Design a protein around this ligand. Structure first.
Ligand SMILES: O=c1ccn([C@@H]2O[C@H](COP(=O)(O)OP(=O)(O)O)[C@@H](O)[C@H]2O)c(=O)[nH]1
Ligand SMILES: OC[C@H]1O[C@H](O)[C@H](O)[C@@H](O)[C@@H]1O
Ligand SMILES: [Mg+2]
Ligand SMILES: [Mn+2]
Lengths: 109, 541
């Protein structure tokens, strides 16, 4: 009951809005972690949103990325602007008991 | 130094447990912290806060995780790192000395103390903050207190010689009348400001005093002139020119204390915080004197007949003033009780040093963390009579948030009760009930201590100011800092931790004559003396 979308291929400088939407749970995303994995790299933390609606950003991503939730806390977004080839990878949304299969993101240059 | 990524990994290792995404969030953020060579002290601090939040999130997510024990230990390590940050990375303090005299004419006594700092700190800029709009606040408070005293003595004339008619009874009855008169002025002030917003405080006060107490406007005008002139010729800096303060979010609370409460100490508690945030440097109360040079009296040992460091320091200051006369009319009451042999050691050493900078220690170059405000200690407790902050210090902003939060709770509770227009006792009983309803496990330390807000400056040991804008807000701010929070109303913290914020003792003498003369409160002893004097004068002894 989790629908992932928003990914694809952009050129350097472009934007994407990642989306994970869940249904069938009371706030399946009341805590959310965004992670990413490039091939031949370890899973890397991108951003987080606490139960207090507190937004925490990795240094490599601050000033470019915005994490957000709807009020029901069932769908989470990742606005990513000014993308670099560095940002290329598979992105994972993680709630307390939910985790996405991964959204491919490719930045071209 | 804080554990690095690999060291946390060793701590929070659980065999066979896969690294969760919320764990990797922690490890990656810790690694990012260790790669912050180029970042400011507050940036580093906010990174620690981030790590703390990520850590809390993990623990909340996997409540029975085998990692939790190590992560809770890690959380404590974060606090150690804060103190390291604080204690390791110092910037120079702006060379400003800040003083405040508001509400009336600055006294020659204040000037003379101020001049001592000036004489040994030629490299320091000095400001004495005043309020050119409110020179008559002290006149108004004095007038109203005396009028209420007379009304009280009149009303209880036949009970005055009654064995049981206490000083307590006097002050209790007088409080009721003061409230009436204070509320009378306050409502006049608010109406006047609505009718004509261009009026200044002194315009309204002198009119009120003329109308209600037949005070002479020409003599009030002449006093304003004298006051303006005296402070200007003494490093005067007008609060009404302090734009950052005037347009900031605590200016209203300052005016509350100045105009409604006639609490100049409370208003000064608020001003001093804005001063250190917006300008930075060293704040001192006007009753504070420079530290005695450490090798002036090194060779005179404390007689056993003097059994506190404070009485000794007191002795030493009186010696300087007896033999050097820097400050006219400084007491020698305590110095004189000394054995002649000791007094002779004193005069002999003071005769040898002939340069004020060898008597009083110049501040010189002081350094502080950009995270903190440094505060003086007395009686093993913190006291905001002396403060050190760089401009825009982090604790500086915590202080303003403490003030805003505390006054928000107070005003939102007290305000609607006052507006019902009841008498002091009714108002007070209802206030008490409201405090009871909004009391919870968090705010109780605060709620239990604001009940006597309306008594401040009129009743023995009316102390509320301490909790509103005094030492309590500093304990709150440091707790804020050390817990990664804001507006902490429960201010429990170790005295160990508080010692990290201590104003350097060598740089002040706190045991002055004037420190013993509180201008905003009075104790029971003083209350008993005032009462007997009020009686005598009423009977015309
Ligand atoms: O009429 C007054 C009374 C007090 N204060 C300010 O309040 C501070 C504290 O006064 P005091 O030393 O009497 O307070 P205590 O140390 O007894 O709490 C002073 O230094 C002033 O800055 C003021 O400006 N005008
Ligand atoms: O907090 C109210 C007052 O009491 C404090 O202990 C300080 O001595 C004084 O500077 C302050 O204005
Ligand atoms: Mg004093
Ligand atoms: Mn004092």
């Amino acid at each position: 009951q989790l629908v992932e979308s928003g990914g694809g291929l952009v050129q350097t400088g472009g934007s994407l809005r990642l989306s994970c939407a869940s249904s069938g749970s009371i706030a399946g995303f009341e805590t959310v972690t965004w992670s990413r994995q490039a091939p031949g790299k370890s899973l890397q933390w991108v951003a987080s949103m606490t139960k207090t609606n507190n937004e925490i950003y990795s240094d490599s991503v601050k000033g470019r990325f915005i994490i957000s939730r709807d009020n029901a806390k069932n769908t989470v977004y990742l606005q990513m602007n000014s993308l670099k080839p560095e940002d290329t990878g598979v992105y994972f949304c993680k709630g307390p008991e939910l985790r996405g299969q991964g959204i491919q993101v490719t930045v071209s240059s | 130094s804080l554990v690095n990524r690999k060291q946390l990994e060793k701590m929070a290792n659980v065999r066979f447990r896969v690294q969760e995404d919320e764990y990797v969030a922690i490890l990656d953020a810790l690694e990012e912290y260790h790669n912050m060579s180029e970042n400011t002290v507050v940036e580093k601090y906010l990174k620690l806060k981030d790590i703390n939040s990520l850590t809390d999130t993990y623990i909340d997510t996997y409540k029975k995780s085998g990692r939790n024990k190590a992560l809770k230990k890690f959380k404590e390590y974060l606090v150690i790192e804060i103190l390291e940050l604080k204690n390791s990375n110092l910037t120079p303090v702006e060379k400003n000395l800040h003083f405040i005299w508001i509400g009336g004419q600055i006294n020659d006594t204040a000037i003379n103390y101020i001049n001592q700092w000036k004489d040994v700190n030629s490299d320091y800029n000095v400001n004495v903050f005043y309020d050119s709009n409110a020179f008559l606040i002290n006149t108004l408070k004095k007038t109203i207190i005396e009028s209420a005293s007379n009304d009280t003595l009149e009303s209880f004339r036949e009970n005055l010689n009654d064995p049981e008619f206490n000083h307590t009874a006097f002050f209790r009855k007088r409080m009721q009348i003061i409230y009436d008169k204070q509320q009378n002025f306050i409502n006049y002030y608010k109406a006047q400001k609505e009718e004509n917003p261009d009026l200044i405080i002194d315009d309204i006060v002198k009119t009120y005093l003329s109308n209600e107490y037949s005070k002479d406007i020409d003599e009030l005008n002449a006093y304003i002139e004298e006051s303006l002139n005296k402070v200007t010729e003494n490093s005067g800096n007008d609060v009404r020119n302090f734009e950052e303060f005037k347009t900031g979010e605590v200016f209203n609370l300052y005016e509350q204390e100045l105009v409604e409460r006639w609490n100049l100490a409370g208003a000064s508690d608020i001003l001093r915080v804005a001063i250190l945030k917006n300008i930075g440097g060293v704040y001192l109360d006007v009753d504070m004197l420079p530290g005695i040079h450490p090798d002036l009296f090194k060779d005179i040992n404390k007689p056993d007949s003097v059994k506190t460091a404070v009485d000794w320091e007191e002795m030493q200051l009186e010696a300087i003033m007896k033999h050097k006369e820097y400050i006219p009319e400084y007491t020698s009451k305590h110095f004189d009780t000394l054995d002649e042999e000791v007094q002779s050691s004193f005069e002999s050493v003071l005769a040898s040093k002939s340069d004020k900078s060898e008597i009083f220690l110049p501040l010189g170059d002081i350094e502080v963390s950009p995270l903190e405000v440094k505060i003086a200690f007395a009686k093993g407790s913190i006291i905001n009579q002396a403060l050190i902050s760089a401009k825009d210090s982090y604790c500086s902003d915590l202080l303003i948030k403490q003030i805003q939060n505390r006054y928000k709770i107070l005003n939102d509770t007290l305000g609607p009760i006052i507006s019902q227009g009841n008498d002091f006792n009714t108002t007070m009983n209802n206030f008490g009930e409201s405090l009871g309803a909004i009391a919870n496990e968090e705010n109780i330390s605060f709620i239990a201590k604001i009940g006597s807000y309306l008594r401040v400056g009129f009743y023995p040991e009316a102390n509320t100011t301490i909790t509103l804008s005094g030492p309590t807000i500093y304990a709150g701010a440091y707790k804020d800092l050390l817990t990664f929070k804001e507006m902490s109303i429960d201010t429990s913290i170790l005295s160990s931790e508080l010692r990290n914020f201590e104003f350097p003792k060598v740089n002040i003498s706190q045991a002055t004559e004037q420190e013993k003369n509180s201008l905003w409160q009075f104790n029971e002893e003083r209350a008993k003396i005032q009462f007997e004097e009020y009686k005598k004068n009423y009977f015309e002894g």
